[PDB]
Amino acid sequence: ADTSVDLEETGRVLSIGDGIARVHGLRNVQAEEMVEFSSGLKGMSLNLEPDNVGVVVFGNDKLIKEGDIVKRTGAIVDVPVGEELLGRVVDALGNAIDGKGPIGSKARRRVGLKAPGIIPRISVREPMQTGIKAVDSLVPIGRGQRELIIGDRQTGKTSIAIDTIINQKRFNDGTDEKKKLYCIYVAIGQKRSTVAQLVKRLTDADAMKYTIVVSATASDAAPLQYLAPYSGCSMGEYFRDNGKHALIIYDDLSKQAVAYRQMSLLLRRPPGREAYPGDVFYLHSRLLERAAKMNDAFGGGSLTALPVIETQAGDVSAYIPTNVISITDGQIFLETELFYKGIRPAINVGLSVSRVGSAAQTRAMKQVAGTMKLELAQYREVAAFAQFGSDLDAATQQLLSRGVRLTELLKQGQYSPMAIEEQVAVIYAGVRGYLDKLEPSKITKFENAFLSHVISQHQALLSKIRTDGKISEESDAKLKEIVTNFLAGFEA
Amino acid sequence: TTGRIVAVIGAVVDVQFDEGLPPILNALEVQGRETRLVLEVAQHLGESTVRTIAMDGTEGLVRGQKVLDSGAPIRIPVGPETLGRIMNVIGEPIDERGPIKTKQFAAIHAEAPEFVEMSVEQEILVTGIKVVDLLAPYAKGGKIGLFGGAGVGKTVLIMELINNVAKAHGGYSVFAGVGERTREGNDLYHEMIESGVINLKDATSKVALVYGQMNEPPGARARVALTGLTVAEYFRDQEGQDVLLFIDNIFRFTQAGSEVSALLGRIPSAVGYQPTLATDMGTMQERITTTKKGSITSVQAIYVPADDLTDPAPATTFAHLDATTVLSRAIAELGIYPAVDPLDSTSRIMDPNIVGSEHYDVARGVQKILQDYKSLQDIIAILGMDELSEEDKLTVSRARKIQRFLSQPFQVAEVFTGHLGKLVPLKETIKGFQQILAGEYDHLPEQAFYMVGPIEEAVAKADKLAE
Amino acid sequence: TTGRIVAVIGAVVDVQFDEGLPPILNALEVQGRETRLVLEVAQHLGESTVRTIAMDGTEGLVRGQKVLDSGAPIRIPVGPETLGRIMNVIGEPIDERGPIKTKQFAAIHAEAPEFVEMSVEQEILVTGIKVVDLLAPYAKGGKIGLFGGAGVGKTVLIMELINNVAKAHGGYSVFAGVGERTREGNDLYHEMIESGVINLKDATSKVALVYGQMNEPPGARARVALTGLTVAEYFRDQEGQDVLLFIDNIFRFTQAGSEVSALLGRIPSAVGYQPTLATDMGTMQERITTTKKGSITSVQAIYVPADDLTDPAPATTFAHLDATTVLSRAIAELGIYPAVDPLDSTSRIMDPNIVGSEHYDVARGVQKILQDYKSLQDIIAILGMDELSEEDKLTVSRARKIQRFLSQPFQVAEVFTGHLGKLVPLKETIKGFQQILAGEYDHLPEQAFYMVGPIEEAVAKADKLA
């Protein structure tokens, strides 16, 4: 009485094609449980139908044939979680892909867990410094916040994310454990050589130590690409639920949607708007709701997400683009026009927002950039309204004079994340009018000179602004003094 | 009755009953679960099998699992002991403060008030917001709609109205969060408390809350509005009070339905929507209403997919409103908040017979000039401004200043504008515009009119700018 | 194993087996035919039936016909004896020169190199083409893509590159003609013979040719890329060789996929394409890559349908390249060749730390002025230049001179330009563009810059224009 293959805990493949197995049997499987194929290939139980189980396959279905035995696992899909993963490159299921040995994982976590409710969280209040003036000054990001990076191909979306990961050494190399931020970088649909390029740079910046990289690339099965985000999320909640701080980049959520769309159509689920499943909003809401700030009652830890979405022809009104803009706590919109024009980052002031506002900003920063955002918005308008110097008054000549100078200061190169006090020093100079008489073309050069001066000579003012976290009345006076005088010697 | 689960595909679960088939709308409870899972019966497939929508996650369900017919549609705790509390789609407290000990329970599904139950009183409801008041006045007991694409101001606008109106309101308020951001229900709850609208120690709570956010399965999202609305109907009928209903965002109810629609076996209507969109919206919107028994003042946020106001959903909702505030990313983009579109916002009380001719002539006066300027915009763009008649370059002037005088620093967006929130009284509004239109400020600079409350601040700001 | 043909629809042949069902991807040989007809298994429909894709026309097949499991996937002759030979999807010679006598055979379906196998060295590959070199430089062992609507310059650009790069390359080359014109295969083969890269006398050929053109049934077009690809993989890993891989056109592989997809019975995705579009591009594109074992510099022409770059096919291809050359009908129609869109082409090497800041600053300099000209164009369009600012008119002058200086005569296009092909050295490009930017030629006329190599020739042309 060989009773190893009863149809309650095992089944047999009725048919297989395009990564979808229609398994017979599996009478006791649970929706969303993981199953195993004779070939050591894992799959996931998505459709539990009267006469069959629709199984999505986490790998090449070429090794699966009609008749194969499929075995339950009794477990709803999960993955390795914890500090062991830092500095490692894993696939969408947790397996290492840096051929640097097994992960020493002691904890596991379901990839699909609902986000903490109302009661367990507290308003986002601690800054999450990117290192990018434009961002940290105009569209501030706090911990527990979800801020979207969106724009066409090549407008610089990933860069924002890398600079951010790199900027975190400051605190991670420090003492304070509350200021530390562990990062997670999920590649989806991307190309292996690009990721390999990516993890190299991170290594060269001495950032891998605090980063985990979940990779679900271009040739990985649709279901791996699909899962990848939830997988990476779960690794971030480990830190979030243990009073630690995590930052996750979903690069990008566009390719995942495609994966979802594919997986979903191959299951024969009727296509919806634009060919995607009627629940693509849900696909991303469920995920991004998980980035959150827990109250002290739950460890005070947090998860901050920076999902990426690719627009086409800079059209942000597009259905997917708006679907995701309506989930996150703001967006950073990058335009190719601005980029080519010299404005890098190509952040579009007017169209980007932060729903957290200044609550995610240090007082030093709030002090200097409190009204700048709506000022630049109003500047872009009149700058357009006078692309014909229409008998323009002074209030608007002053508006155009600040607008241009401030625009130059928000410019920034790559890989050189600035420290908060450094940002405050340079914005200060502009916002206060000390630069209204310098020539726009000069501004970039001046900022390198000025910053040099204060960093070298004046670290007492930098350390105080940084420390007090505010701009006291004397600091504000020591600063006025430095800028005006250096400026003069500078314009000799 | 006891049925078994025969198929699970997402939020849709098919159940087979041996004897006694639960009627459509009935709620069934799945046996064997750490948490309460309710399934609403959606259809009778035949063969004593019903197709249902899950009110929560379907993970771990098994074919063959047991399901008991509860014998009635989802019923929730309704009454005064709901005030100051936070409820679920299915009526469970989610605030960790214990049971909700109501005398009665109500089914979230119910018929809308009959035609002979309608009321036609029309009283302006002043809000303190220049634009709304001036051009698209809200009406007490009326149906109000805030239309807007992602991130243009729907919620903040709902936030400042709670402050400028809900806060003084002598009556209850019900705020139903439908498919919106969890972070947001936590911001509001704690704000209600810090301002005593919610009292955790006594019975002075003047607001009940119901939530079915974006982290929920379609099913929950297709019903929270019902739960929310049901709580509100109680205070309207059984107590006869003046209710204030806030829903953010009702589009989510309709997106919820479109998300399971295909699994319900339906040919899609246009734009992907389900073929029953309008009727689904109708039987709901028709309950959100003032009657002779009580009064409801509903403020509903309405999402606009792809920013397209013609999208079957936003498009289908206009007919259910008495006043509409249409927000626009093109306005917002310029830094003009609130980003209301002055030429696409309307109110059923913008009638000389109701607000008066001074109110009316100003409003229309402001709209003509903004329209007049809209038309010229594209043209002076290319052909420039020299050739324009001094008569026409004055309307460009006044328009650009009005465009600004219409912005205002909200008290709930100081974190955004870096400006103290201003609330302007209806007469300060009418007058301010009357004067701009009258040529009484053609000397001050436009910028003086941007982000200010009353016209006097525009005059003061001119000086401050004077240098 | 012997199965029987149960159904036939175009290129989708369903075969039933009684004992021993072949795994997916296995090649079956249909029995009773004048020529070879290979069927590639695609899926197990259950009931001991397999749905397959024919590799040649299916006319004549009959239900109940016998089919034999080959026991493996399409396998093809791989090694140096393929050099100088023309071969089929299924690896048979089609150059009427006998059998390709190789030691080994490789199967066209392989997995992509692993993460740990990846490389990250970034070396610039100079081509002698001004626009490419200056603005979206290619890279050794990198992945290049030339996007182009019908008749814009994709093939001419591949030819010129074959000339300028392949010709003096130490190492092998593989040209894979996918879904294109047969005459072109013929034009190339004979040309290759002539310049001696193909030698029918000695073993000195440096090129292997694989073709599955516009006349083949969908399945052939759907697999030849894999076939050219495999040939290239052999030189890379089995000989640690530096390869060059040219494909015209990789869009055809995806199109082929869309042709059979309904037949495989799949609900279509957007624009009628197959729901498996991205993964199909993916497991294929991911083998076209440099690794620690060998280098593959690959240039792929990407046909853009109806000129729509938002088309699922081209749209999904951007993510696989390191450098892209987007060709434009609008530019072509102005007479600028190559019709490269300067504000739409990019290259992951356009980094100061790789091309040097001199290069990086001229490059961004040129784009900024063309971007600026681009915004003035709307107004220039109704009202011309009159109303323009003296300053604005100088950007316009410079932009129109930079735009013309980006064009250049290709040897390969001499019959059409009426001019002798030019190859400009990088430093000559960086320079010539500096000066233009710098106002050192604001006196010359635009026409002086049109169709020339080095700037020095632009000055001359100006004298001749007098």
From Swiss-Prot, chain A:
Protein modification: Acetylated on lysine residues. BLOC1S1 is required for acetylation.
Record's subcellular location: Mitochondrion inner membrane; Cell membrane
InterPro entries recorded: ATP_synth_asu-like_sf, ATP_synth_asu_C, ATP_synth_asu_C_sf, ATP_synth_F1_a_nt-bd_dom, ATP_synth_F1_asu, ATPase_a/bsu_AS, ATPase_F1/V1/A1_a/bsu_N, ATPase_F1/V1/A1_a/bsu_N_sf
A Pfam family that the UniProt record links to this protein: ATP-synt_ab_N
Keywords: Acetylation, ATP synthesis, ATP-binding, Cell membrane, CF(1), Glycoprotein, Hydrogen ion transport, Ion transport, Magnesium, Membrane, Metal-binding, Methylation, Mitochondrion, Mitochondrion inner membrane, Nucleotide-binding, Phosphoprotein, Pyrrolidone carboxylic acid, Transit peptide, Transport
Gene Ontology terms for molecular function: ADP binding; ATP binding; proton-transporting ATP synthase activity, rotational mechanism
Residue positions where N6-acetyllysine is found in the record: 62, 65, 71, 100, 106, 169, 178-179, 200, 244, 366, 373, 437, 445, 470, 478, 480
UniProt cross-references to Gene3D superfamilies, sorted A to Z: 2.40.30.20, ATP synthase alpha/beta chain, C-terminal domain (1.20.150.20), P-loop containing nucleotide triphosphate hydrolases (3.40.50.300)
Omega-N-methylarginine: modified positions: 143
Record's bilayer topology term: Peripheral membrane protein
Residues carrying the site annotation Required for activity: 352
Chain positions with Phosphothreonine modification: 73
Quaternary structure (record): Homotrimer. Component of the ATP synthase complex composed at least of ATP5F1A/subunit alpha, ATP5F1B/subunit beta, ATP5MC1/subunit c (homooctomer), MT-ATP6/subunit a, MT-ATP8/subunit 8, ATP5ME/subunit e, ATP5MF/subunit f, ATP5MG/subunit g, ATP5MK/subunit k, ATP5MJ/subunit j, ATP5F1C/subunit gamma, ATP5F1D/subunit delta, ATP5F1E/subunit epsilon, ATP5PF/subunit F6, ATP5PB/subunit b, ATP5PD/subunit d, ATP5PO/subunit OSCP.
Listed HAMAP family: ATP_synth_alpha_bact
Homology family: Belongs to the ATPase alpha/beta chains family.
Comment field (misc): The siderophore enterobactin (Ent) produced by enteric bacteria binds Fe(3+) and helps bacteria scavenge iron ions from the environment. As a consequence, the mammalian siderocalin LCN2 plays an important role in defense against bacterial infections by sequestering iron bound to microbial siderophores. LCN2 can also bind iron bound to endogenous or nutrient-derived iron chelators and plays an important role in cellular iron homeostasis.
Identification of the protein by name: ATP synthase F(1) complex subunit alpha, mitochondrial
From Swiss-Prot, chain B:
Residues the record marks as carrying a glycan: 48
The keyword Mitochondrion appears for this protein: yes
Catalytic reaction annotation: ATP + H2O + 4 H(+)(in) = ADP + phosphate + 5 H(+)(out)
GO molecular function: ATP binding; ATP hydrolysis activity; proton-transporting ATP synthase activity, rotational mechanism
Membrane topology listed for this record: Peripheral membrane protein
Residue positions where N6-succinyllysine is found in the record: 66, 103, 201, 206, 464
Binding site for ATP: 151, 153-156, 181
Domain of life: Eukaryota
Binding-site residues, phosphate: 151-155
One cellular-component annotation, GO: mitochondrion
Modified residues (Phosphoserine): 357, 375
SMART domains according to UniProt: AAA (SM00382)
Residues that bind ADP: 151-156
Enzyme class at the top of the EC tree: translocase
Sites bearing Phosphothreonine, chain numbering: 254
Protein name per UniProt: ATP synthase F(1) complex catalytic subunit beta, mitochondrial
Upper taxonomic lineage: Eukaryota, Metazoa, Chordata, Craniata, Vertebrata
Gene coding for it: ATP5F1B
